Design an enzyme around this catalytic site. Structure first.
Site, mmCIF file in Angstrom:
data_model
loop_
_atom_site.group_PDB
_atom_site.id
_atom_site.type_symbol
_atom_site.label_atom_id
_atom_site.label_comp_id
_atom_site.label_asym_id
_atom_site.label_seq_id
_atom_site.Cartn_x
_atom_site.Cartn_y
_atom_site.Cartn_z
ATOM 1 N N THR A 138 0.870 -1.282 0.101
ATOM 2 C CA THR A 138 -0.084 0.061 -0.101
ATOM 3 C C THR A 138 1.034 1.379 -0.071
ATOM 4 O OG1 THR A 138 -1.891 -0.876 1.130
ATOM 5 C CG2 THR A 138 -1.710 1.341 1.241
ATOM 6 N N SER A 139 0.345 2.194 -0.711
ATOM 7 C CA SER A 139 1.112 3.564 -0.661
ATOM 8 C C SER A 139 0.067 4.667 -0.363
ATOM 9 C CB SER A 139 1.814 3.793 -2.234
ATOM 10 O OG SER A 139 2.748 2.778 -2.325
#
Ligand code: MG
Ligand code: MG
Ligand code: MG
Ligand code: MG
Lengths: 233, 195, 204, 226, 196, 222, 211, 195, 196
Positions: free
Chosen positions: I1-2
């Site tokens: 995830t970013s």
């Protein structure tokens, strides 16, 4: 039972003739990541006490709120809240020390090492330590984590025993504290250059210094160091 | 293969050794002789891990019999015990040690004295008036400490031995199927066929 | 399980005025079981005395080893080995088994036949040398012995006074150790006479 | 243990405490942690004490033989290289942590060596359980172009920090000074700040206090003539 | 640790921090991680200091012997010797090495040798615990055929950030410049790079 | 995993005289190889001519002492200011300790005072509550170093009378307070030499019919 | 530790050692391993001394409350059972206790062995502790019901000595007790060191030991 | 407390139970009666973990005695066994189960029939002509399979039981110190005092 | 995830990738990690999706009830409710949340709540597995009081690099703009952001 996540390193302190000094860097580490650079880990309680906390930051923020609530609660139905029945360092410490030991006795500790520094009503210096186990002790110099290994040796050269306290001035004590913080910056991998320092004097009251930096550092000798043994270039 | 006792009296050494051999939950044999004659006047009883006990005992026997033929001479019980100890001390630091405890009962023809040596699998040697291995001593030593004299006859030694076995039979959880008793004296080695 | 505390036992050595003393208990056991009350832990090679505590099989093995080595030393050197030299030999011999050590705590004691200087030394299991002026302790009751020796000991004691000091250090330390006792021997060593005394103690 | 090394103008100095421990017990109160590799190459050792001796002797033996073979005085880099290659080979099982210092025809040198075989260069170093107390002092007071007297002072002050503040360190301070164009001076018990006070009582017993069962003369002499 | 090697117009530059840690204790704050295996072939070391020193020493020995027989070795050849050690002894090693060197024929070259013992020739390479934080910065700011001054600024800025975020990295920034002109050592102190 | 226990070192010693009693202990507080304090009192006056020291894990020791002092306070309230006898205090502490049989106070506790006949008394406890009256007892880190010495110099163990050769024991003559204090100081001086956790300072509390008195002595700081 | 107790013609004998160890270190030379529940009841102690002391003193409370309610002294059978029932509540929690309950009631002299498992056994002779095997040997070979009080006291005393000698974790001193219908009678503390030499001489036993 | 046998003959049920009780390495007792009378014509023998066996047995006994008084009536052996089974089936999913195996020998006065029930600690109930728990069956069942008839007299049942015990005494490693034998028939429960 | 949240002149913008993985398998490549707890208070979620969804739902419930009684809550208040859940249930949660919102009084505010349950008010915040690779880029390129277009470019460029290096991140770049003007959703596809 838990594990600490966001952490704060050493808190150092010492007694001097008219009061106490306490200091701590402004870093909130996330393991080896130096995540947060604007964390205040010295929390004043009134104008006579400063609580310095190391360890888990989420637990520090919880303690910070307990102290803030303690001040509110003391003022309730208390006409002498800003006078004879104001909070003392010894009251604040014993409260925290009770909480820490109770939490460890439920096997759900507040993952911290705390130093409560302040000055009592009668002008006596107060300096005492407490940690996640509920262990307490007092000494002319106190430090947590790395400070215990590197700072205490330096601070104890100034105040080696109780009789050295009256001989030690605030300028000498502050100088020793500031030097210790520089040493910790050199040698503690989880330290920062920026720190806060607080002085609680029985005459001049509480002086809280923010945005301090480690200065006068020695690095120039590094240019001459080459290789790891036999290398000349 | 757990129970081995020894007692040195006036003029002889007596070794008592259990007769049971157990595989799993079944007693396979109730007449097993846990002993080897190393020389005409030296007897060795043994106890420990399965297989290792006999293999070690026979290996020692072969070496002493080889010495006897080479020199046309019987080694003293002391010399034999020292040889055996070294082999076990050698063995304990081997890749796979021999898990064997022994009692060596011998009559020294030169000194005209009986001699009992106790050696465990580590190579821990001690000369004793009476000895045992494993838990055998826990039950029997209090009786031996009380009744034992160095001037006992062979018949008195056997009576004290009977009392030791009776106590074992009473307080030990395991059934060891009685003991085979052998006597080592100046005339050699003989077995007490009724015990 | 712990090899250094299966069989039990203690040794202690002290220096005095123109004399040394070395003493040991007589117990050998299999943990809780007492097996022998005649298991002496002090040996001598000429005028050099060696006390060994720890795993009994190694004690016996090392004695036989140092007897072997000192007998050859003497045949080649045409003289008896001295305590300082022997100390180095013990150290060397132990460290050659650095990664498969003998579980022992040796103690050397003696007087240099040429200088007349009293000498004592202790080792850890892999041969680290502790050359103390005052006293050396070894065994399952080493903590107890340290406590006794540190308080009872005073330098330059005469032989017959040293005897009482070392004897009481040993006896009272052993009486606070379950794995030591069952008798005790003390050697009092002078440049050309050695006296060996068996002590009377409780047998539990 | 607390050991340090400090470079100065015309040489180098090392120092150490004198306490050896087995857990919380003090085995020796006046241990010698300063080892000689060659006349002008000395090392201080922390960690497993039998390993710091054994390895310092071995390398010292081979260094001496090398010096004889090459008709040259031994170099510190030679001791350093021989030590680390030996230690690396045993993958840290030889628990030797050393500070190696000395002078040779090349100049004056100061190195540290860890048990796994890694080495470091520096003007000031510390090792052992009291290294943090010592380093704190060194980082506070060290400077470039120290004199011999300033370096000995700094060195012994760093050891003291360990003595007082570290439980694994204590008793006395040993020092060895290796200056260029001079003999190395080994200063055993340079400082003695921990002498035991006189006891309140004498525990000398009356003769005859101990109970005896048997006495006998021990024959230490060889088999006699006639 | 924070290390990197960057090729540019006139050759190649190696860059590194100077912090060595034993847990949270800084065992050495002035470490030299820029290691010479030949006149104009250097390496940046990460991982076990014992392992990387032992490797670098063996490589230096091989290239010294190579030179005696066959003349100056190539940067590729040096990388192959590193690889051969790191690959064949991967079970007992923890070494992350970057090899950089200057030929007149090939000019500046960079090879990276990660944990497994694989080899990768690149325009630039980053490695160490602090490299994680500058993958984005370095990818965005790298250009081929930079000038010496531009490349020094790039390395200085990059390691500055790696040091800022990585606790295992810090101290001074050492650099080694490899060109036809020779070998130039550079050093940059905290007061310089922290304010970038 | 969280370990609720810790070791703060320290060593304590209680000796019972004929008409007095002493409870001594070092003032050093430690964790691992670090010193926390060189002077952190460990022996306390709990009132009613009783002194107490809970050696081991400082947090549990401070909690137990705190509770006992409270038990004394409530004993007065509940029983018309009656004095708490040393034997009654001992039995009370057993119940304080055993209330945590399944999460003990990691401390070896000692109390000292005078019995109801005016004689010296020392009671020794284990972490879970078992107790018993003794004449001499060292507790804590260097207990094993000190107790053999006390067996020898207080109860004259293994000491016989010259000339008899082990037939007649050395008679058990009573010791004076000054004599006891010498043995205490020499005990701690010896322990300090060979035990790293012992040092800094020695605080002794002496209990007599006149009350409680304190004596302090320096110890080596290494 | 070593404890034993046996019934005989004129009551029950109870003998125990006095040693306590913390590994190899002897923490106590003189520990009371007998619990004076009341003037007619005794309890031995094996295992956790804390658990032995606490629960047997709590038994005394129950035995006293019994007497007050019923106006009659509690039986040994009932007393032993109250104790076993306390153990069964902390079944599995980690208590450690092995005690013989000795007394005299309507049915004559009584002896019950009770252990943490909640086990409750009646019998003429019992012995517990690390040195019980040594004690049993002396007992089994010399025990008779026709024993005199003098000989019985010696037997229990001698049986502990046997254990104290051989067992490393047993020793210090011997505490004797004789239980009659008029209550229990303490027959003193006997140093083993002194007793050993004394017995060796008078009895001729322990020949192997040099004295 | 390991060996318990049961055999249902023509007009009675016979239960044989070992006499040994072992604590550690010492046999504490060689006369232990591992049985409880639940009602005049119902006997229960038991074996399993120390303490749990007697506690469970006495708890069952109390419940059946309570029922007997409340209804002035003796429950059938079948009813008693079902009650006991449920208690064990209840127990196996408890926080700390009662580790107890039982044999219930009863004479049904209504049907005029002997009945033997075998129930293990899980609550596994089976009615059998002969039964055992643990390893007891491994040694004895081959003999019982061979010699057993349903029309056997009490005296023949005892003789077959003696043969089972003799085989146990021969091939079992443990010494269980003989057995106490009890007979359950129309006249109630009695003990065979010579066996 | 970013994920990241960035304050600027007119308010605040939340940014996120759209990849959800179960090991190396992409369970969802079009995830919406930008979650609404109030009209102008949104959050970015990282960690256990089950945990972060359950938390966000409870928070949305608390703020809905708060609003019924006391009117529009502050962004600080929202962060406090998140914190209270994450701190008190830290033993049974694995959630890394960033809270962002717009007041007229306070304007754009960003709070980050990492694993422990601590709270930190910041000018901008980054989180998720891919945040590690852009600490340097984001520190160097962030400015206070950026324009909407500048802030969109900053987030777009930043998450572009996070996606590039982090295997756990990818898909599209979603953004939510919180201003006085209202709520604007943005989306950027691979062909757009990969070529940056
Ligand atoms: Mg004993
Ligand atoms: Mg120290
Ligand atoms: Mg979950
Ligand atoms: Mg991707």
């Amino acid at each position: 039972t838990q594990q600490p996540i966001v952490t704060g390193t050493s808190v150092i302190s010492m007694k001097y003739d008219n009061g106490v000094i306490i200091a701590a860097d402004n870093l909130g580490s996330y393991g080896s990541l130096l995540r947060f650079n604007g964390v205040e880990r010295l929390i004043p309680v009134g104008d006579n006490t400063v609580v310095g906390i190391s360890g888990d930051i989420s637990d520090m923020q919880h303690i910070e709120r307990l102290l803030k609530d303690l001040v509110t609660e003391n003022a309730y139905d208390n006409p002498l809240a800003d006078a004879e029945e104001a909070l003392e360092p010894s009251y604040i410490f014993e409260y925290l020390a009770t909480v820490m030991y109770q939490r460890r006795s439920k096997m759900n500790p507040l993952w911290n090492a705390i130093i409560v520094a302040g000055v009592q009503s009668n002008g006596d210096q107060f300096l005492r330590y407490v940690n996640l186990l509920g262990v307490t002790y007092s000494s002319p110099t106190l430090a947590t984590g790395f400070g215990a290994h590197m700072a205490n040796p330096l601070l104890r050269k100034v105040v080696d025993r109780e009789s050295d306290i009256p001989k030690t001035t605030v300028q000498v004590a502050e100088e020793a504290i500031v030097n210790a913080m520089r040493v910790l910056y050199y040698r503690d991998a989880r330290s920062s250059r920026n720190f806060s320092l607080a002085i609680i004097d029985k005459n001049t009251g509480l002086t809280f210094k923010k945005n301090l930096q480690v200065e006068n550092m020695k690095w120039d000798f590094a240019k001459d160091i080459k290789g790891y043994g036999t290398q000349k270039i | 293969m757990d129970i081995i006792l020894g007692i040195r009296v006036q003029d002889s050494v007596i070794l008592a050794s259990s007769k049971a051999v157990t595989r799993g939950i079944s007693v396979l044999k109730d007449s097993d002789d846990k002993t080897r004659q190393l020389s005409p006047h030296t007897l060795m009883s043994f106890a420990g891990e399965a297989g290792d006990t006999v293999q070690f005992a026979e290996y020692i026997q072969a070496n002493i019999q080889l010495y006897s033929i080479r020199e046309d001479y019987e080694l003293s019980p002391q010399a034999v015990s020292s040889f055996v100890r070294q082999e076990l001390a050698k063995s304990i630091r081997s890749r796979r040690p021999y898990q064997v405890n022994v009692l060596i009962g011998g009559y020294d023809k030169k000194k005209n004295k009986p001699e009992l040596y106790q050696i465990d699998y580590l190579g821990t040697k001690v000369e004793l008036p009476y000895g045992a291995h494993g838990y055998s001593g826990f039950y029997t030593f209090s009786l031996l400490d009380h009744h034992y004299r160095p001037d006992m006859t062979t018949e008195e030694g056997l009576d004290l031995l009977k009392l030791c076995v009776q106590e074992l039979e009473k307080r030990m959880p395991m059934d060891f199927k009685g003991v085979i008793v052998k006597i080592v004296d100046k005339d050699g080695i003989r077995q007490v066929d009724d015990f | 399980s712990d090899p250094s505390s299966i069989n039990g036992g203690i040794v202690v050595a002290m220096t005095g005025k123109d004399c040394v003393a070395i003493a040991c208990d007589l117990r050998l056991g299999s943990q809780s079981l007492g097996v022998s009350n005649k298991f002496e832990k002090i040996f001598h090679y000429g005028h050099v005395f060696l006390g060994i505590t720890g795993l009994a099989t190694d004690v016996t093995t090392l004695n036989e080893m140092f007897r072997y080595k000192t007998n050859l030393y003497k045949l080649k050197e045409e003289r008896a080995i001295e305590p300082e030299t022997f100390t180095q030999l013990v150290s060397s011999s132990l460290y050659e088994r650095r990664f498969g050590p003998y579980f022992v705590g040796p103690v050397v004691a003696g007087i240099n036949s040429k200088s007349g200087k009293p000498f004592i030394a202790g080792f850890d299991l892999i041969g680290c040398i502790d050359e103390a002026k005052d006293f050396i302790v070894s065994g399952t009751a080493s903590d107890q012995l340290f406590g006794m020796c540190e308080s009872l000991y005073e330098p330059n004691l005469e032989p017959e006074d040293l005897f009482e000091t070392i004897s009481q250090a040993l006896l009272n330390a052993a009486d606070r150790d379950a794995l030591s006792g069952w008798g005790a021997v003390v050697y009092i060593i002078k440049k050309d006479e050695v006296v060996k005394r068996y002590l009377k103690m409780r047998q539990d | 243990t607390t050991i340090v090394g400090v470079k100065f103008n015309n040489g180098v100095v090392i120092a150490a405490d004198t306490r050896s421990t087995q857990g919380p017990i003090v085995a020796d109160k006046n241990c010698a942690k300063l080892h000689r590799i060659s006349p002008k190459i000395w090392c201080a050792g922390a960690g497993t004490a039998a390993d710091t001796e054994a390895v310092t002797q071995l390398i010292g033996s081979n260094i001496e033989l090398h010096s004889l073979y090459t008709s040259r005085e031994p170099r510190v880099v030679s001791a350093l290289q021989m030590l680390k290659q030996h230690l690396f080979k045993y993958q840290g099982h030889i628990g030797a942590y050393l500070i190696v210092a000395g002078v040779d025809p090349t100049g004056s040198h100061l190195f540290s060596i860890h048990a796994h075989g890694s080495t470091d260069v520096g003007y000031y170093l510390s090792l052992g359980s009291g290294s943090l107390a010592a380093m704190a002092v060194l980082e506070s007071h060290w400077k470039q172009d120290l004199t011999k007297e300033e370096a000995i002072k700094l060195a012994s002050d760093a050891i003291q920090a360990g003595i007082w503040n570290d439980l694994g360190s204590g008793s006395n301070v040993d020092v060895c000074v290796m200056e260029i164009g001079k003999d190395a001076e080994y200063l055993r018990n340079y400082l003695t700040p921990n002498v035991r006070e006189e006891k309140q009582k004498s525990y000398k017993f009356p003769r005859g206090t101990t109970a005896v069962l048997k006495e006998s003369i021990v024959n230490i002499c060889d088999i006699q003539e006639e | 640790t924070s290390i990197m090697a960057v090729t540019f117009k006139d050759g190649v530059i190696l860059g590194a921090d100077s912090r060595t840690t034993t847990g949270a204790y800084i065992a050495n704050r002035v470490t030299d991680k820029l290691t010479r295996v030949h006149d104009k072939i250097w390496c940046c070391r990460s991982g076990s200091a014992a392992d990387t020193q032992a490797i670098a020493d063996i490589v230096q020995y091989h290239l010294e012997l190579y030179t005696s027989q066959y003349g100056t070795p190539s940067t590729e050849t040096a990388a192959s010797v590193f690889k051969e050690l790191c690959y064949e002894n991967k079970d007992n090693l923890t070494a992350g090495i970057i090899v950089a060197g200057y030929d007149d024929k090939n000019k500046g070259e960079v090879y990276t040798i990660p944990l497994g013992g694989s080899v990768h020739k690149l325009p630039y390479a980053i490695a160490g615990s602090g490299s994680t934080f500058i993958y984005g910065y370095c990818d965005k700011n790298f250009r081929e055929n930079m000038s010496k001054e531009e490349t020094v600024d790039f390395i200085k800025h990059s390691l500055s950030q790696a040091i800022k975020w990585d606790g295992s990295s810090g101290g001074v920034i050492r650099m080694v410049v490899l060109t036809a002109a020779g070998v130039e050592r550079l050093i940059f102190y905290p007061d310089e790079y922290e304010q970038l | 995993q969280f370990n609720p226990y810790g070791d703060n070192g320290g060593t304590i010693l209680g000796i019972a005289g004929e008409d007095f009693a002493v409870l001594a202990g070092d003032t050093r507080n430690i964790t691992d190889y670090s010193i926390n304090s060189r002077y952190e009192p460990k022996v306390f006056d709990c009132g009613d001519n009783i002194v107490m020291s809970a050696n081991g894990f400082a947090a549990d020791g401070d909690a137990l002492v705190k509770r006992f002092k409270n038990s004394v306070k409530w004993y007065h309230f509940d029983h018309n200011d009656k004095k708490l006898s040393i034997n009654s205090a001992a039995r009370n502490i057993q119940h304080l300790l055993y209330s945590r049989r399944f999460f003990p106070y990691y401390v070896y506790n000692i109390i000292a005072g005078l019995d109801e006949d005016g004689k010296g008394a020392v009671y020794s406890f284990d972490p879970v509550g078992s107790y018993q009256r003794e004449q001499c007892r060292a507790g804590g880190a260097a207990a094993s170093l000190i107790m053999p010495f006390l067996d020898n110099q207080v109860n004259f163990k293994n000491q016989y009378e010259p000339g008899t050769n082990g037939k007649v024991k050395k008679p058990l003559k009573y010791l004076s307070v000054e004599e006891v204090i010498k043995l205490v100081r020499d005990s701690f001086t010896s322990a300090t030499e060979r035990h790293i956790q012992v040092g800094d300072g020695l605080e002794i509390l002496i209990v007599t019919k006149d009350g409680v008195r304190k004596e302090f002595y320096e110890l080596k700081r290494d | 530790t070593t404890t034993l107790a046996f019934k005989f013609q004129h009551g029950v004998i109870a003998a125990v050692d006095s040693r306590a160890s913390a590994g190899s270190y002897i923490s106590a030379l003189r520990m009371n391993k007998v619990i004076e529940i009341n003037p007619y009841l005794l309890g031995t102690m094996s295992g956790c001394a804390a658990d032995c002391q606490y629960w047997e003193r709590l038994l005394a409370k129950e035995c006293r409350l019994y007497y007050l309610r019923n106006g009659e002294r509690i039986s040994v059978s009932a007393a032993s059972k109250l104790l076993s029932n306390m153990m069964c509540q902390y079944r599995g929690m980690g208590l450690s206790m092995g005690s013989m309950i000795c007394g005299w009631d309507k049915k004559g002299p009584g002896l019950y062995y009770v252990d943490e498992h909640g086990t409750r056994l009646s019998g003429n002779m019992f012995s517990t502790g690390s040195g019980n095997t040594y004690a049993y040997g002396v007992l089994d070979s010399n025990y008779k019901w026709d024993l005199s009080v003098e000989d019985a006291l010696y037997l229990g005393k001698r049986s502990i000595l046997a254990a104290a000698h051989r067992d490393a974790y047993s020793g210090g001193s011997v505490n004797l007790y004789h239980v009659t219908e008029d209550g229990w009678i303490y027959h003193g503390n006997h140093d083993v060191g002194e007793l050993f030499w004394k017995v060796k001489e008078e009895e001729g036993s322990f020949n192997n030991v040099i004295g």
